[PDB]
Amino acid sequence: GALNNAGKGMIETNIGNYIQQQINLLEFIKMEMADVAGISKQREG
Amino acid sequence: TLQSSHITEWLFTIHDDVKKRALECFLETAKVALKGRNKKFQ
Numbered sequence: 001g002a003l004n005n006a007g008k009g010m011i012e013t014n015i016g017n018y019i020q021q022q023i024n025l026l027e028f029i030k031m032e033m034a035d036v037a038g039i040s041k042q043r044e045g
Numbered sequence: 046t047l048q049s050s051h052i053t054e055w056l057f058t059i060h061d062d063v064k065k066r067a068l069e070c071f072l073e074t075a076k077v078a079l080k081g082r083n084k085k086f087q
Contacts, residue, residue, distance in 0.1 A: 045049040 034040055079086055 043048055044052070045046065 031041075034044075
């Protein structure tokens with residue numbers, strides 16, 4: 001009876017979470033460089 | 046915005062230097078043009 005039921009499969013990959021992890025890491029590293037240089041975000045604008 | 050203006054004030058500074066030199070150039074050009082029998086300068 002699985003041929004008339006069970007819904008439709010989905011080839012889904014959780015790449016969005018990976019992308020968000022990369023974006024968060026980029027923000028963290030940019031903030032870290034700003035802190036090391038002593039040139040804060042409020043200090044650049 | 047001032048601290049952001051600092052980021053492009055280097056462009057503006059070199060632009061000002063170029064403008065100054067261009068105006069000295071135009072001044073010497075006008076000085077040479079003076080002695081060419083043009084009645085506009087009168």
